[PDB]
Coordinates of C-alpha atoms and ligand atoms in Angstrom, one line a residue:
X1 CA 29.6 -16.1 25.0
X2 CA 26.7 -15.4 23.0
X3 CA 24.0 -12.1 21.7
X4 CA 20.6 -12.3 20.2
X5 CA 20.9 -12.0 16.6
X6 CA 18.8 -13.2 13.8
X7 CA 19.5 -15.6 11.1
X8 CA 18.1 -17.6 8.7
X9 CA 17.0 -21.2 9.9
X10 CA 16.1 -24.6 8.4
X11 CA 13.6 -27.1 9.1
X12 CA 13.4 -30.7 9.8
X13 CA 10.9 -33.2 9.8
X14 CA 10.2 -37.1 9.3
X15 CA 8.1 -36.4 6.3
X16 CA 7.5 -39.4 4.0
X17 CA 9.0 -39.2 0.2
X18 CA 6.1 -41.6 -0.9
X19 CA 3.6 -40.0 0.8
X20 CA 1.1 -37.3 -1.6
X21 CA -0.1 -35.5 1.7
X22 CA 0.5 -32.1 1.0
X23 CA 2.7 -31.3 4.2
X24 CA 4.7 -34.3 3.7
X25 CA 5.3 -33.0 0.3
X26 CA 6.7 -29.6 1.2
X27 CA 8.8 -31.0 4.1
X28 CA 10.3 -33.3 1.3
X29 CA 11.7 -30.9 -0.9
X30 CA 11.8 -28.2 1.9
X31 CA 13.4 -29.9 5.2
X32 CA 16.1 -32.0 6.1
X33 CA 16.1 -35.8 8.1
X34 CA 15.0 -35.2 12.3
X35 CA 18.2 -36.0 14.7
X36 CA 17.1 -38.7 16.6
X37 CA 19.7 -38.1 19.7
X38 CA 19.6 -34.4 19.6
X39 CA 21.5 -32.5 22.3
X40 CA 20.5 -30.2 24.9
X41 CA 22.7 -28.5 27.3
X42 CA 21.3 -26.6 30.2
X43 CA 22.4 -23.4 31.6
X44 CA 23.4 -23.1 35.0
X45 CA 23.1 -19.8 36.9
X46 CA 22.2 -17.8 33.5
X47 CA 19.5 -15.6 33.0
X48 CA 17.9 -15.2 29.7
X49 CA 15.3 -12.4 28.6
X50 CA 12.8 -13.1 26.0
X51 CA 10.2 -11.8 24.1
X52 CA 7.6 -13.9 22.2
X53 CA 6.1 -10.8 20.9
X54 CA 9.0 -10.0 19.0
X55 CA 10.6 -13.3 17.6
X56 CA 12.1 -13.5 14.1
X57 CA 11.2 -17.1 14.5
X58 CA 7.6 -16.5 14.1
X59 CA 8.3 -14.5 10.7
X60 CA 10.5 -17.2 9.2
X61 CA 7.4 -19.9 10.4
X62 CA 4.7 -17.6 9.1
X63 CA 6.8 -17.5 5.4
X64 CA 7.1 -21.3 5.3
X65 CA 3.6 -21.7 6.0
X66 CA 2.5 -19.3 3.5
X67 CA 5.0 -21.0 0.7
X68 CA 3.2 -24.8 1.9
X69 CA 0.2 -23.4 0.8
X70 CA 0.6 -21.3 -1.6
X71 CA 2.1 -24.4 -3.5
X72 CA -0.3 -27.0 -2.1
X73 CA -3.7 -25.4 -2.0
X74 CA -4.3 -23.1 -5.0
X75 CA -7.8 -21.7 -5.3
X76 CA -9.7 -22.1 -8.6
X77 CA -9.7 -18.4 -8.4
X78 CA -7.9 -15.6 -6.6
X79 CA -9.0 -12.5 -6.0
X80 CA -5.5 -10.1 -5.1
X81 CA -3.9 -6.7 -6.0
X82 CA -7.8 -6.1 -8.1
X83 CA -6.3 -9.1 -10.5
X84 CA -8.4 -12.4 -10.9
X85 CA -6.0 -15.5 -11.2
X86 CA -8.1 -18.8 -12.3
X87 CA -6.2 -21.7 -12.0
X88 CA -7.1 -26.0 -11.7
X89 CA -8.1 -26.4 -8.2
X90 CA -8.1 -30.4 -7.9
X91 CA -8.8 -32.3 -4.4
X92 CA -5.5 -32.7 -2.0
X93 CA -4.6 -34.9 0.9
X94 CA -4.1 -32.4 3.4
X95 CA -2.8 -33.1 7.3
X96 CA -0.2 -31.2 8.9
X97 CA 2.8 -32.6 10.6
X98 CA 5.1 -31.4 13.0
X99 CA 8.4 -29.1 11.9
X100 CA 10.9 -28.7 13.6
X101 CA 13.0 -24.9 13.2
X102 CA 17.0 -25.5 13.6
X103 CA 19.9 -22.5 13.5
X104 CA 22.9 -23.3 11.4
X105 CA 26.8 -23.4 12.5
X106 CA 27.6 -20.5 14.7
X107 CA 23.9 -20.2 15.8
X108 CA 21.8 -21.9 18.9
X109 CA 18.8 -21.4 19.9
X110 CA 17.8 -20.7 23.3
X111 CA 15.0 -22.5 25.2
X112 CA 13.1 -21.1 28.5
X113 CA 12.1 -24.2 30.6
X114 CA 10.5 -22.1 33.6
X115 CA 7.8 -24.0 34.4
X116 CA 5.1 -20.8 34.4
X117 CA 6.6 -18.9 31.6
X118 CA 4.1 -16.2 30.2
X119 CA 6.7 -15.5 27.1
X120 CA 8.2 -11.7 28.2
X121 CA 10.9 -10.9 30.4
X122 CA 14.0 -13.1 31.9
X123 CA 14.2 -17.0 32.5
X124 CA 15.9 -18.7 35.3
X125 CA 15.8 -22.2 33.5
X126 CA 17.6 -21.9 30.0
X127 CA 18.6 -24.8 27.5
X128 CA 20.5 -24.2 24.5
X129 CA 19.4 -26.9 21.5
X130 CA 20.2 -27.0 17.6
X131 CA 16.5 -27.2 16.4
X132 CA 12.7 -26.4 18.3
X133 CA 10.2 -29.2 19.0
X134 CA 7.9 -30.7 16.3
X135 CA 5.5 -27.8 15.6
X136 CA 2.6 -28.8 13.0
X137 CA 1.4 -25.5 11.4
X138 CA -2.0 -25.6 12.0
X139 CA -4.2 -22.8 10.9
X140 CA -6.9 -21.6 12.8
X141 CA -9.3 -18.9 14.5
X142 CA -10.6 -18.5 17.6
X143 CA -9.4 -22.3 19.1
X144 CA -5.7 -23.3 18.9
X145 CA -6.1 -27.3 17.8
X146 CA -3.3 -29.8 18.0
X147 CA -0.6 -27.7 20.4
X148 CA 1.3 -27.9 22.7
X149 CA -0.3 -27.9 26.4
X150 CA 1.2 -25.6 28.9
X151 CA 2.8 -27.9 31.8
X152 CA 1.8 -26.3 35.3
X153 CA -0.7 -23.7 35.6
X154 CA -2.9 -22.2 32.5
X155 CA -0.9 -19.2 30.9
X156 CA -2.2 -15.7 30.0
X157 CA -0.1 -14.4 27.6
X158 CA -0.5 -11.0 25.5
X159 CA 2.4 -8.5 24.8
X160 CA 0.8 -5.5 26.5
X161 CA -2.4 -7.0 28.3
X162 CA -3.4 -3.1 29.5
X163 CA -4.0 -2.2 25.7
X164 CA -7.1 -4.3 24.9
X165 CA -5.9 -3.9 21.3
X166 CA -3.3 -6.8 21.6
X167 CA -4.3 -10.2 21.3
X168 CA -4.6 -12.7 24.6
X169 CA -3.3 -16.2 24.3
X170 CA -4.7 -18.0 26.6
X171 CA -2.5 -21.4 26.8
X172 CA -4.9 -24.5 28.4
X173 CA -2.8 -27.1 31.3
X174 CA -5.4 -29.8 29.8
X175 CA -6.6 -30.4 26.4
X176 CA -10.1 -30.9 25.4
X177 CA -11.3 -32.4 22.2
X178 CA -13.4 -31.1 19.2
X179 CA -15.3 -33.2 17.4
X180 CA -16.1 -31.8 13.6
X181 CA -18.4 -34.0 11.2
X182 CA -19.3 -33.4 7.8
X183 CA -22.1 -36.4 7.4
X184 CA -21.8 -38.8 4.4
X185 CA -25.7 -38.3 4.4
X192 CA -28.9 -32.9 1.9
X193 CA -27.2 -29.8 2.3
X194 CA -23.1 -30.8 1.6
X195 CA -22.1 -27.9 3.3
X196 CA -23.7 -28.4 6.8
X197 CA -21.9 -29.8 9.5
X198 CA -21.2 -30.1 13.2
X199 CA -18.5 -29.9 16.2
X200 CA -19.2 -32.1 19.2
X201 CA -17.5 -31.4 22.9
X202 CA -17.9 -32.6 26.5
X203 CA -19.9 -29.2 27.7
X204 CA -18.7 -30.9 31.4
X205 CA -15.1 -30.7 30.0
X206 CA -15.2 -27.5 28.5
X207 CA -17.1 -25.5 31.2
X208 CA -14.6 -26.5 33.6
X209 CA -11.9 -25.4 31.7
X210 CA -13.5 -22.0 31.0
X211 CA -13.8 -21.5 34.2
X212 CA -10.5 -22.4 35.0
X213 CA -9.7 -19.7 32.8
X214 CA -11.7 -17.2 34.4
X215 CA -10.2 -17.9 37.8
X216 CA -6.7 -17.3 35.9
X217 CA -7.9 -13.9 34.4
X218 CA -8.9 -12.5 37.5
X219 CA -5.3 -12.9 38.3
X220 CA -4.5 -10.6 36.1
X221 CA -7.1 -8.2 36.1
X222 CA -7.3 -6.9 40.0
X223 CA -10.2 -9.8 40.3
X224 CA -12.8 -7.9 38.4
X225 CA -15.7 -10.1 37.2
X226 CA -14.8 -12.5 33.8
X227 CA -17.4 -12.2 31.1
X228 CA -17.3 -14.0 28.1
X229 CA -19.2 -13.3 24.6
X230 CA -19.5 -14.0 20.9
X231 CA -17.6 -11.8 18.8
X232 CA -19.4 -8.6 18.1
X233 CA -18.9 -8.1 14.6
X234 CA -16.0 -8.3 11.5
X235 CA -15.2 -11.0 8.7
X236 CA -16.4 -15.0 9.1
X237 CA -13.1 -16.0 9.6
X238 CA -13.0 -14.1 13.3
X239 CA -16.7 -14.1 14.2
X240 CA -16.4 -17.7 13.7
X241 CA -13.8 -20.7 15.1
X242 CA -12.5 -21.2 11.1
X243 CA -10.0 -23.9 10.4
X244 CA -9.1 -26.6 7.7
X245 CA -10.1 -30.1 8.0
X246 CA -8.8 -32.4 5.4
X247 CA -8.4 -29.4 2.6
X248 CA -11.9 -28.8 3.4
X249 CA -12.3 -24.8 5.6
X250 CA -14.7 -25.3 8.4
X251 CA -16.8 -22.0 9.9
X252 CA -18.5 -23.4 13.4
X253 CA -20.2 -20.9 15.6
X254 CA -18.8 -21.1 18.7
X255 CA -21.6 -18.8 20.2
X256 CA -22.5 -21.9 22.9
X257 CA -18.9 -22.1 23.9
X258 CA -18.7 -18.6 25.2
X259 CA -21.3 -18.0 27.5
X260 CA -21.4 -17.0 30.8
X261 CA -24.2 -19.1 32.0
X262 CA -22.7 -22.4 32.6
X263 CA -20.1 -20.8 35.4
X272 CA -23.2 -30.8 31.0
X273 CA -24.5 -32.6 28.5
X274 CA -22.7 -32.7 24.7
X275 CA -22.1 -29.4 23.0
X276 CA -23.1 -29.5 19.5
X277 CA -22.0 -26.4 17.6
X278 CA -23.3 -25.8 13.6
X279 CA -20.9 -25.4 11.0
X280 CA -20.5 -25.1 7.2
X281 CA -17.9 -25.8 4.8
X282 CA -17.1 -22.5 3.0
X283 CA -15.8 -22.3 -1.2
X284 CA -15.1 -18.7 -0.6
X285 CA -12.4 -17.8 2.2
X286 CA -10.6 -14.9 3.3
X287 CA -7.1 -15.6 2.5
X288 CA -5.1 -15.9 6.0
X289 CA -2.6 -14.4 4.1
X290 CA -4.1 -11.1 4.3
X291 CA -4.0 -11.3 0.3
X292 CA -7.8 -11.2 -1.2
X293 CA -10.4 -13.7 -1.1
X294 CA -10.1 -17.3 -2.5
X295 CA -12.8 -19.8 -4.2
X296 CA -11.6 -23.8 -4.0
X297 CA -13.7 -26.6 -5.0
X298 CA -17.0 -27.8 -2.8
X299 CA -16.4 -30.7 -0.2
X300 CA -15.3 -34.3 -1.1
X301 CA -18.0 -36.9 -0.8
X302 CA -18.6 -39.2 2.3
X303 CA -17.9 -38.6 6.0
X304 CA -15.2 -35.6 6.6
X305 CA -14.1 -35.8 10.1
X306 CA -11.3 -34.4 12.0
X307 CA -11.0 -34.8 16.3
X308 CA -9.0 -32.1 17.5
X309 CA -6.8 -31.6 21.0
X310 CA -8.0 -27.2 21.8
X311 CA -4.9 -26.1 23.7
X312 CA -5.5 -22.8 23.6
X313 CA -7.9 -20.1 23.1
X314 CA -7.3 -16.7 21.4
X315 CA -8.9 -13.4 23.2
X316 CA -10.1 -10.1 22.4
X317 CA -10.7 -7.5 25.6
X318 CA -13.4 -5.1 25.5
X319 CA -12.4 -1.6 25.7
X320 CA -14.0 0.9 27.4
X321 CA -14.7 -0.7 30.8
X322 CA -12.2 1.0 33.3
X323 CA -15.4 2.5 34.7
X324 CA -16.8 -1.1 35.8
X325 CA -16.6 -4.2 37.3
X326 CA -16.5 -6.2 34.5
X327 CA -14.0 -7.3 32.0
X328 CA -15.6 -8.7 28.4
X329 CA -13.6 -11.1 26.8
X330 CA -14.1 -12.5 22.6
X331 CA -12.7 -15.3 20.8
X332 CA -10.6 -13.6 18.0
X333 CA -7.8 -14.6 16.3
X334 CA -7.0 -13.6 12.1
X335 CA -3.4 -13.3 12.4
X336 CA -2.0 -16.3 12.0
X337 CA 1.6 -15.4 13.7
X338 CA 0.1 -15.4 17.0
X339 CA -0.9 -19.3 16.3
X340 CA 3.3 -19.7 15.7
X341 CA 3.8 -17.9 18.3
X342 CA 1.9 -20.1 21.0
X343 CA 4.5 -22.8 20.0
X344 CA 7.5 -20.4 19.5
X345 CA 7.5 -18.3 22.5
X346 CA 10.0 -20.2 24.7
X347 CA 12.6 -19.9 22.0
X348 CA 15.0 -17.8 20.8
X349 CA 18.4 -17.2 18.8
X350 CA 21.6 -16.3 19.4
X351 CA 25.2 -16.4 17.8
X352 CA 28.0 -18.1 19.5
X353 CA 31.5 -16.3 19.6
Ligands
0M4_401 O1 -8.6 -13.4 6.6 C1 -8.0 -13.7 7.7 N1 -7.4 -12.8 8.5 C2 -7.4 -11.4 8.3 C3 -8.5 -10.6 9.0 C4 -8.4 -10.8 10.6 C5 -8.0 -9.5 11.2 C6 -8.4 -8.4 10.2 C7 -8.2 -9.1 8.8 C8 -9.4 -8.6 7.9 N2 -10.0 -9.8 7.4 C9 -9.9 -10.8 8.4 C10 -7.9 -15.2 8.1 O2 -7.3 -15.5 9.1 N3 -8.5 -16.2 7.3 C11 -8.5 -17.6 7.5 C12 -8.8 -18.5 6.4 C13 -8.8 -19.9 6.6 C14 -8.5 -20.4 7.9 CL1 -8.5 -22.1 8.1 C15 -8.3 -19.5 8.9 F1 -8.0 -20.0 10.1 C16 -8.3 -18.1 8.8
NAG402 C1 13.4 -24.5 37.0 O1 13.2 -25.7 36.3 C2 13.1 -26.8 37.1 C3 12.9 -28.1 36.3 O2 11.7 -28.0 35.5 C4 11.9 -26.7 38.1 O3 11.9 -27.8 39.0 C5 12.0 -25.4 38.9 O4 10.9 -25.1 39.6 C6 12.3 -24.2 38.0 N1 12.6 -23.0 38.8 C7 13.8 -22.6 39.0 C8 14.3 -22.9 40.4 O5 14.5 -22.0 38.2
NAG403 C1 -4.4 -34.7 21.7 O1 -4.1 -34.4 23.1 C2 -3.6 -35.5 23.8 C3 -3.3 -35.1 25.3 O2 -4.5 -34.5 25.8 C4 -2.3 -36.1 23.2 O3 -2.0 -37.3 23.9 C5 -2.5 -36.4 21.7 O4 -1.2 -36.7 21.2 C6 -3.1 -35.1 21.0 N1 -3.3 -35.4 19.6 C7 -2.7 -34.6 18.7 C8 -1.8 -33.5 19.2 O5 -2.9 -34.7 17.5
NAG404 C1 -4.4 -26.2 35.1 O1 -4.0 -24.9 35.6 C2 -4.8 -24.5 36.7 C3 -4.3 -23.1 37.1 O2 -4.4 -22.2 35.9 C4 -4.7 -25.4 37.9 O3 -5.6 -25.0 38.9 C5 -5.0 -26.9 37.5 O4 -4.6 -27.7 38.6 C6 -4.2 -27.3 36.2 N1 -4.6 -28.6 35.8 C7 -3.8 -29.5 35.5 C8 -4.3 -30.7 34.7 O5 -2.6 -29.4 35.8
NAG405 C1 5.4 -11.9 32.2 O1 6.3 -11.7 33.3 C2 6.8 -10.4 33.3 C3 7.8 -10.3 34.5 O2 8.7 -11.4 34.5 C4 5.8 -9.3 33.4 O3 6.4 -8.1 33.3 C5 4.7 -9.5 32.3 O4 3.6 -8.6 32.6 C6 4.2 -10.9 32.3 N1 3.3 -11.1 31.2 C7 2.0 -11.4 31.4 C8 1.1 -11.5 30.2 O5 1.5 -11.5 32.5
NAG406 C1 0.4 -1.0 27.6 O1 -0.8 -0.5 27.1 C2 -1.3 0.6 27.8 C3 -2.6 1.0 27.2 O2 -2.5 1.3 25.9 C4 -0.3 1.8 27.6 O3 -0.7 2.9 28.4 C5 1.1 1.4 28.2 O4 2.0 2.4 27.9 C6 1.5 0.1 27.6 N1 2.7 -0.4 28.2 C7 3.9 -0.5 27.6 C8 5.0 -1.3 28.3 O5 4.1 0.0 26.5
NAG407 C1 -16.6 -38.0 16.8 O1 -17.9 -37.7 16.8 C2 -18.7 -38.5 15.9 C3 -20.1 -38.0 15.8 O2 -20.8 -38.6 14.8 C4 -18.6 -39.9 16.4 O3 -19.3 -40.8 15.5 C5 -17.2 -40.4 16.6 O4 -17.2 -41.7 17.3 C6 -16.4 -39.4 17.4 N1 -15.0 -39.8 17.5 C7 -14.3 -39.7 18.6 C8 -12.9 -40.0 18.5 O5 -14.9 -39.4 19.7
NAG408 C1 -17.5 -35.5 29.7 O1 -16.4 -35.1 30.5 C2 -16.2 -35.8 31.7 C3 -15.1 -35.2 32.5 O2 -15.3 -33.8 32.7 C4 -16.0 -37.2 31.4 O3 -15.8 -38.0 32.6 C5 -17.2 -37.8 30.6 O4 -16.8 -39.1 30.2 C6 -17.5 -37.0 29.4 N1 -18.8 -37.4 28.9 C7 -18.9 -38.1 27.8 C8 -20.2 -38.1 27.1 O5 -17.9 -38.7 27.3
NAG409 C1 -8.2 -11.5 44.4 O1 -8.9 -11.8 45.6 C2 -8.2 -12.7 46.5 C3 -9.1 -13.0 47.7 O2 -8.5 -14.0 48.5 C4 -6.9 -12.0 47.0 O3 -6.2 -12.9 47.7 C5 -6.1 -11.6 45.7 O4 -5.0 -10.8 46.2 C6 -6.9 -10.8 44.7 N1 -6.2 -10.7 43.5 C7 -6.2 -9.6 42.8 C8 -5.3 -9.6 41.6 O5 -6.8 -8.6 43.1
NAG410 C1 -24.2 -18.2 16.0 O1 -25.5 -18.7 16.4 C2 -26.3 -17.9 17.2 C3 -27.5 -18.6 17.6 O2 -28.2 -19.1 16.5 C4 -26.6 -16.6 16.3 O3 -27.4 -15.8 17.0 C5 -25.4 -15.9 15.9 O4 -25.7 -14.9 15.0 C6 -24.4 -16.9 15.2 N1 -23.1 -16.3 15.0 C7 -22.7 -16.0 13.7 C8 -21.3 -15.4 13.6 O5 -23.4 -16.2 12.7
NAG411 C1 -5.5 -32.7 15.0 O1 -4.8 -33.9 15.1 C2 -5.6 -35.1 14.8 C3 -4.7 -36.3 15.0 O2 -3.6 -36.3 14.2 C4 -6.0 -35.0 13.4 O3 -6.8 -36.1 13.1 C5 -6.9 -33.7 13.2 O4 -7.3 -33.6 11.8 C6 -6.1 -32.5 13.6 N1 -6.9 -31.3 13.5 C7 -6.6 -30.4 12.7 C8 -7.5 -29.2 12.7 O5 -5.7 -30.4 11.9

């Protein structure tokens, strides 16, 4: 027999010890060895409940994260608590790999396999396993990059979707790539994201088609954020240590429901700490090409309030809180203790 219960988990990985990428680093000192015949037994005839939305998982994720960078990517100066902390900010090899979270003796975790699984409520297909799938802790706004895709239909998931204050995570069925250039040759700062408008468009509308699901099939609109810090009125992310602001105005339009979709971006010194702690400086961009191509698996949503009165439901890319990123990996798990 078993009861939720939280407890503090480990991490594994197939880091490299040679290796001076950052995440590789960490995972060293921080994780253990993968198993490479890990065991998974499935339940027969047992139904789980879960809840993404509240998932100590996420915390324990969010505070590993948070210690990866805080030792890996100090700012030359820090901005917290009213204090100013300068410190050397020297260029890092920065790409993150994929951890994996694992419960300890007398602990299992618990993994929903229901094909359609929105993150709330019971599962009919539950798997117990020792440790999560590799999740790389990738941190962005706006777009989730490099995730996991969902397996059947295209997910809506939100903890309360009603209260237009909580978060949508809309998780995508098909990936589609993001192509983000900083030219070797000017203005060091400017860059670009490329993407197949044909892909995209279809997918947004695919996404539509699913929101109406769930909102009594009133009309889908889309729009740019309408106001609050960079970091949420923009899709922000890091791309080889270097933070990239694009304006993802093109991407969220309601017109096109072909050609490449070229969105303008800059490389930003001063950040908003994801950390909620302050603002940060870092160094300006490396020399030559900076490029990273990027798998979107998922979008993060805002609903408008204020709209009960209409036809129409106005959906934002947001994002800011970095937990809900985890938690588009994390929701199908859970812990328990064994007897
Ligand atoms: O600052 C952030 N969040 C906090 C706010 C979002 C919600 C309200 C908070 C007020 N300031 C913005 C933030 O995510 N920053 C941030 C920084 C770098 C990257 Cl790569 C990123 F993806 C996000
Ligand atoms: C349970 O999982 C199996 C395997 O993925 C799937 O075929 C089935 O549709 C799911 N639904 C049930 C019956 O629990
Ligand atoms: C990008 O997505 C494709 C599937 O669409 C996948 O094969 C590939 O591994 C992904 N790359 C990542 C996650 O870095
Ligand atoms: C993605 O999900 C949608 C429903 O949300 C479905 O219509 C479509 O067939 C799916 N695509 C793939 C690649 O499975
Ligand atoms: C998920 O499914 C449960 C019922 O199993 C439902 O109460 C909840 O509204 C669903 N979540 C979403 C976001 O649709
Ligand atoms: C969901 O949000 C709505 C709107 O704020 C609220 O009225 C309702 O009580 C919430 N539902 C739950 C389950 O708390
Ligand atoms: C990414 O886009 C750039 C645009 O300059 C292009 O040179 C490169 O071939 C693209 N890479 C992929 C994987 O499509
Ligand atoms: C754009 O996407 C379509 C599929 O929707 C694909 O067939 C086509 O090759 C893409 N165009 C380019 C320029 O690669
Ligand atoms: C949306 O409209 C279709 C029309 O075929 C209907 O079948 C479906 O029940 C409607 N869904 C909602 C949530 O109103
Ligand atoms: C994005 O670009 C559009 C078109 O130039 C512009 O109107 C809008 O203000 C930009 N968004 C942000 C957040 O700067
Ligand atoms: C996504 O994965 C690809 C392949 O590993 C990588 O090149 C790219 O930098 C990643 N994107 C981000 C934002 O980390």
């Amino acid at each position: 027999v078993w009861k939720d219960a939280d407890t503090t988990l480990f991490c594994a990985s197939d880091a490299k010890a040679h290796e001076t990428e950052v995440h590789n680093v960490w995972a060293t000192h921080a994780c253990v060895p993968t198993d490479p015949n890990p065991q998974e037994i499935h339940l027969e005839n047992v139904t789980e409940n879960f809840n993404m939305w509240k998932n100590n998982m996420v915390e324990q994720m969010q505070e590993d994260v948070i210690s990866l960078w805080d030792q890996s990517l100090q700012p030359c100066v820090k901005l917290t608590g009213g204090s100013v902390i300068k410190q050397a900010c020297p260029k890092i090899s920065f790409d993150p790999i994929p951890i994996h979270y694992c419960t300890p003796a007398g602990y299992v975790i618990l993994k929903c396999n229901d094909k359609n699984f929105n993150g709330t409520g019971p599962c009919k297909n539950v798997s117990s396993v020792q440790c999560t799938h590799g999740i790389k802790p990738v941190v962005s706004t706006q777009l989730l990059l490099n995730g996991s895709l969902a397996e059947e239909e295209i997910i809506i998931r939100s903890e309360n979707l009603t209260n237009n204050a909580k978060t949508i995570i809309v998780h995508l069925n098909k990936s589609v790539e993001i192509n983000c250039t900083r030219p070797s040759n000017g203005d060091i700062r400017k860059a670009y994201c490329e993407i197949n408008g044909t892909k995209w468009n279809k997918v947004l509308k695919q996404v539509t088609e699913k929101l109406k699901e769930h909102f009594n099939n009133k009309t889908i609109i889309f729009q740019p954020p309408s106001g609050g810090d960079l970091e949420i009125t923009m899709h922000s992310f890091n791309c080889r240590g270097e933070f990239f602001y694009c304006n993802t105005t093109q991407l969220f339009n309601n017109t096109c429901i072909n050609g490449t979709i070229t969105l303008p971006c800059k490389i930003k010194q001063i950040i908003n700490m994801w950390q909620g702690t302050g603002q940060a400086m870092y160094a300006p961009p490396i020399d030559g090409k900076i490029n990273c191509v990027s798998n979107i698996t998922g979008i993060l949503l805002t609903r408008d309030g204020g709209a009960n009165n209409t036809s129409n439901e106005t959906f934002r890319p947001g994002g800011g809180n970095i937990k809900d990123n985890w938690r588009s990996e994390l929701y199908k798990y859970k812990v328990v203790q064994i007897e």
